[PDB]
Structure formats: structure tokens, C-alpha cells
Design an enzyme around this catalytic site. Structure first.
Site, mmCIF file in Angstrom:
data_model
loop_
_atom_site.group_PDB
_atom_site.id
_atom_site.type_symbol
_atom_site.label_atom_id
_atom_site.label_comp_id
_atom_site.label_asym_id
_atom_site.label_seq_id
_atom_site.Cartn_x
_atom_site.Cartn_y
_atom_site.Cartn_z
ATOM 1 N N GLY A 15 0.836 -1.186 0.000
ATOM 2 C CA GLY A 15 0.000 0.000 0.000
ATOM 3 C C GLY A 15 0.874 1.241 0.000
ATOM 4 O O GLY A 15 2.037 1.222 0.405
ATOM 5 N N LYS A 16 0.319 2.329 -0.491
ATOM 6 C CA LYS A 16 1.057 3.576 -0.604
ATOM 7 C C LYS A 16 0.062 4.711 -0.549
ATOM 8 O O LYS A 16 -1.077 4.563 -0.971
ATOM 9 C CB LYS A 16 1.848 3.606 -1.918
ATOM 10 N N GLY A 17 0.518 5.848 -0.038
ATOM 11 C CA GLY A 17 -0.320 7.040 0.094
ATOM 12 C C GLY A 17 0.522 8.290 0.202
ATOM 13 O O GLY A 17 1.744 8.247 0.092
ATOM 14 N N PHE A 19 1.373 10.018 2.712
ATOM 15 C CA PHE A 19 2.300 10.071 3.856
ATOM 16 C C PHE A 19 3.405 9.013 3.860
ATOM 17 O O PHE A 19 4.414 9.172 4.545
ATOM 18 C CB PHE A 19 1.528 10.070 5.168
ATOM 19 N N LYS A 37 5.216 -0.350 7.801
ATOM 20 C CA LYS A 37 4.832 1.004 7.395
ATOM 21 C C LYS A 37 6.049 1.889 7.598
ATOM 22 O O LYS A 37 6.623 1.933 8.674
ATOM 23 C CB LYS A 37 3.602 1.523 8.136
ATOM 24 N N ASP A 132 -12.410 6.346 12.217
ATOM 25 C CA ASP A 132 -12.082 6.192 10.786
ATOM 26 C C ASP A 132 -12.482 4.840 10.172
ATOM 27 O O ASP A 132 -11.819 4.320 9.268
ATOM 28 C CB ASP A 132 -10.596 6.455 10.542
ATOM 29 N N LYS A 134 -13.728 2.332 7.726
ATOM 30 C CA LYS A 134 -13.968 2.287 6.290
ATOM 31 C C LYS A 134 -13.419 1.002 5.737
ATOM 32 O O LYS A 134 -12.596 0.345 6.389
ATOM 33 C CB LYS A 134 -13.326 3.486 5.590
ATOM 34 N N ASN A 137 -9.645 0.141 5.799
ATOM 35 C CA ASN A 137 -9.048 -0.064 7.127
ATOM 36 C C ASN A 137 -9.502 -1.382 7.784
ATOM 37 O O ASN A 137 -9.144 -1.646 8.936
ATOM 38 C CB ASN A 137 -9.402 1.101 8.056
HETATM 39 N N1 LIG Z 1 -5.184 -1.108 4.212
HETATM 40 C C1 LIG Z 1 -3.729 -0.914 4.018
HETATM 41 C C2 LIG Z 1 -3.473 0.433 3.328
HETATM 42 O O1 LIG Z 1 -2.775 0.551 2.319
HETATM 43 N N2 LIG Z 1 -4.024 1.544 3.910
HETATM 44 C C3 LIG Z 1 -3.832 2.899 3.367
HETATM 45 C C4 LIG Z 1 -4.886 3.866 3.956
HETATM 46 C C5 LIG Z 1 -6.329 3.527 3.558
HETATM 47 O O2 LIG Z 1 -6.518 3.626 2.160
HETATM 48 C C6 LIG Z 1 -2.420 3.353 3.719
HETATM 49 C C7 LIG Z 1 -1.513 3.710 2.724
HETATM 50 C C8 LIG Z 1 -0.230 4.122 3.081
HETATM 51 C C9 LIG Z 1 0.123 4.183 4.424
HETATM 52 CL CL1 LIG Z 1 1.711 4.713 4.831
HETATM 53 C C10 LIG Z 1 -0.770 3.830 5.423
HETATM 54 C C11 LIG Z 1 -2.041 3.409 5.065
HETATM 55 C C12 LIG Z 1 -3.173 -2.071 3.182
HETATM 56 C C13 LIG Z 1 -1.626 -2.160 3.204
HETATM 57 N N3 LIG Z 1 -1.294 -2.175 4.646
HETATM 58 C C14 LIG Z 1 -1.134 -3.394 5.322
HETATM 59 N N4 LIG Z 1 -1.234 -4.505 4.510
HETATM 60 C C15 LIG Z 1 -1.188 -5.780 5.023
HETATM 61 N N5 LIG Z 1 -1.000 -5.974 6.358
HETATM 62 C C16 LIG Z 1 -0.909 -4.871 7.169
HETATM 63 N N6 LIG Z 1 -0.741 -4.865 8.499
HETATM 64 C C17 LIG Z 1 -0.660 -3.599 8.951
HETATM 65 C C18 LIG Z 1 -0.848 -2.795 7.841
HETATM 66 C C19 LIG Z 1 -0.981 -3.586 6.699
HETATM 67 C C20 LIG Z 1 -1.511 -0.877 5.265
HETATM 68 C C21 LIG Z 1 -3.037 -0.876 5.413
#
Ligand SMILES: NC1(C(=O)N[C@@H](CCO)c2ccc(Cl)cc2)CCN(c2ncnc3[nH]ccc23)CC1
Length: 330
Positions: A15-17, A19, A37, A132, A134, A137
Site C-alpha cells: 500500500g502507498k499514500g 504520507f 509502514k 475512521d 472504512k 481499514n
Molecule cells: N489497508 C492498508 C493500506 O494501504 N491503507 C492505506 C490507507 C487507507 O486507504 C495506507 C496507505 C499508506 C500508508 Cl503509509 C498507510 C495506510 C493495506 C496495506 N497495509 C497493510 N497490509 C497488510 N498488512 C498490514 N498490516 C498492517 C498494515 C498492513 C496498510 C493498510
């Protein structure tokens, strides 16, 4: 301060965003896999995301529940913050619902119950409001059980009917009382539960417009409607969770989660069995290995990873030395 970025192999972007990013990693010494993260200090400072980041760190460190993501390590470098968390191999509910359109009422019930268990814990045992909820999450572990991720919007210290002030959340999920911007309480989480469960059973948001002006008007003013195939108990639950007046909302009284737990939609659910993961998930993720990312968007997993490889005491305005980033779970 034992573990560092050099202790991990960086495998795949999850995942990426705006921040930062989340990467699938292997701890070399143990062979165990985690989601890491990684946040750039400079970005967090520039975007006024510091308080949120610190809140997530505390909430993760202070919480232990079957349906909340567990934190293994948190640490920092001169330019980054790193949270090493349990990897939810089953992906986001967003991913699944995007492909399947709707879940059955039974499947939505299973997820709803695990979410209620988690939120009850947060409210009752930790005095935390999540704020939050959704589909992005709400993740699935390798066994198909819920894992809530991303605690940065949480508020700590909210006991009983204590109120909160901050305007925050995701636009399509905002509760009417949040939009009114005149203080709100813990029942905002039950509105959020309503929206996600509505999405699961009905295949769309309860209120939508691409223009936030119009969207907010709908949330505030428009009576809820349901597709006419929705069963009576599901309609009743969602109607109660999506009451616009938090005082009239299911979960909005002194009993909090217990009012939802007693609703006839959850008739027959034994809540201690939910906690103990004794309900069989209706969908079992079919991952073939600890590194299988089939339940993550290819938009992310296809991207190349190049992690950047003294400065341990550096503490600047743009790259502060943050507190409570020397954590390894006991
Ligand atoms: N839902 C995730 C995600 O990308 N969330 C987004 C926000 C909602 O759109 C996100 C993007 C970037 C960052 Cl830095 C933090 C969160 C999926 C990838 N992530 C994870 N993937 C798999 N296992 C995970 N365990 C803890 C986090 C996590 C972060 C949460």
C-alpha cells in the site's frame, strides 16, 4: 534499540499514500513476515500529520485484541519512522467488495460481529474512539478473521459520554454530528459501522456525490433507503446504526456496544465465541505462501522497491527525534 532497517528483507509494496508506504518484509534472523509502514519524517511534519502518527504508535502499543492489528516493533532512523506490524495476508475488505459487489447477510454478519467486538474493547477497555471505520481499514488475516488497521485518527481518554471536537474522518463516512462541528461522542463509531455494513450488504455507499458539498447535504438531510431485497433484520440494524441523531442511534446510549450486540440481526451469536475466534470465517483466503500478495491491488504490488540504506541523535525541526519509537513487543 536492537532492530534496525538492515534486519529486514523488503519484498513487495502492499500500500502507498501521501504520507508513506507499507512493504511486506521478512525479518532475516527469524524468517517471520510482517507489514512495515515506513513514513518520512519530513513529510509528516510538512503535512501536520505528526499528532496522528504518534497517536497510532501509542494506540498500537497499548492494545491487544484478536481483531486489532498487532505491533511487533516501532523504531526510527534520522529520516523515517518504521512500524513493523502483523501482515494481514487476506487484504482489504475494499479489495473483495470491489470484485464481488455484495456480501451475503451471513458474511456481513460475521465481519460486523468481529468489528463490534473490537470497537467494544476500544470504547470499554481502552477509552478510545476509532473515528475512521472504512473498507480500506478493515483487513483479513490469513485465516479470514478481521484485522483493523490504521489508528492515527483515534482519540484517547474518552470515557463514557465524554465529547470530542476535531473534524476528521473520510468524507463519505462522516457522521452527521461530525459534519455539524459542534462536538460529538463515541457513537460516531456506530455510524461508521452502519456505513461499512450497508456497503457490504447493499453494494454501494448509503450517501454519495462526487461533490463534497452535495455529499454532506445528503448525509445531513436525506432519509436512508435500502434495496428491496434486503431482509427485515438487516434493514432494522442499518436503520438504527444510521440514525442521524446520535442520541437515537443504536449504540448511542449508556450501554454503547451492548445495544448493538443485543439486536435481533445478531440473534444466536455468542459474543465470547466471537472473541475466541470460534466462528468459522465464511471466506478463507487461498494464499499459497507467506509471501502471496494475490489479495492486494497490482497497482501497488507491481511497483519496484528501492529502500534507501552517524545520525542516531539528530533532532531537527523537519526531522525530529520522536518519543516512544524504541518498541519491541514483549
Ligand atoms: N489497508 C492498508 C493500506 O494501504 N491503507 C492505506 C490507507 C487507507 O486507504 C495506507 C496507505 C499508506 C500508508 Cl503509509 C498507510 C495506510 C493495506 C496495506 N497495509 C497493510 N497490509 C497488510 N498488512 C498490514 N498490516 C498492517 C498494515 C498492513 C496498510 C493498510
Amino acid at each position: 534499540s536492537r532492530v534496525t532497517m538492515n534486519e529486514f528483507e523488503y519484498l513487495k509494496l502492499l500500500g502507498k499514500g501521501t504520507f508513506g508506504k507499507v512493504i511486506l518484509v521478512k525479518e532475516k534472523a527469524t524468517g517471520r513476515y510482517y507489514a512495515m509502514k515506513i513514513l518520512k519524517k519530513e513529510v509528516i511534519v510538512a503535512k501536520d500529520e505528526v499528532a496522528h502518527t504518534l497517536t497510532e504508535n501509542r494506540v498500537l502499543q497499548n492494545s491487544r485484541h484478536p481483531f486489532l492489528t498487532a505491533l511487533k516493533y516501532s523504531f526510527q532512523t534520522h529520516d523515517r519512522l518504521c512500524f513493523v506490524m502483523e501482515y494481514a495476508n487476506g487484504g482489504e475488505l475494499f479489495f473483495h467488495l470491489s470484485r464481488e459487489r455484495v456480501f451475503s447477510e451471513d458474511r456481513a454478519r460475521f465481519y460486523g460481529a468481529e468489528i463490534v467486538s473490537a470497537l467494544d474493547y476500544l470504547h470499554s477497555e481502552k477509552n478510545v474512539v476509532y473515528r475512521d471505520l472504512k473498507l480500506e481499514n478493515l483487513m483479513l488475516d490469513k485465516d479470514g478473521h478481521i484485522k483493523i488497521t490504521d489508528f492515527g485518527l483515534c482519540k484517547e481518554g474518552i470515557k463514557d459520554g465524554a465529547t470530542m471536537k476535531t473534524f476528521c474522518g473520510t468524507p463519505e463516512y462522516l457522521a452527521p454530528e461530525v459534519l455539524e462541528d459542534n462536538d460529538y461522542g463515541r457513537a460516531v463509531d456506530w455510524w461508521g459501522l452502519g456505513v461499512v455494513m450497508y456497503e457490504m450488504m447493499c453494494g454501494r455507499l448509503p450517501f454519495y456525490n462526487q461533490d463534497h458539498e452535495k455529499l454532506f447535504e445528503l448525509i445531513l438531510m436525506e432519509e436512508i433507503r435500502f434495496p428491496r431485497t434486503l431482509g427485515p433484520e438487516a434493514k432494522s440494524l442499518l436503520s438504527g446504526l444510521l440514525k442521524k441523531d446520535p442520541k437515537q442511534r443504536l449504540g448511542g446510549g449508556s450501554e454503547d456496544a451492548k445495544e448493538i450486540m443485543q439486536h435481533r440481526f445478531f440473534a444466536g451469536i455468542v459474543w465470547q465465541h466471537v472473541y475466541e475466534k470460534k466462528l468459522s470465517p465464511p471466506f478463507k483466503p487461498q494464499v499459497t505462501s507467506e509471501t502471496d500478495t494475490r489479495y492486494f491491488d497490482e497497482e501497488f504490488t507491481a511497483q519496484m522497491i528501492t529502500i534507501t540504506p552517524s545520525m542516531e541523535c539528530v533532532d531537527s525541526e523537519r526531522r525530529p527525534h520522536f518519543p516512544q519509537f524504541d518498541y519491541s513487543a514483549s
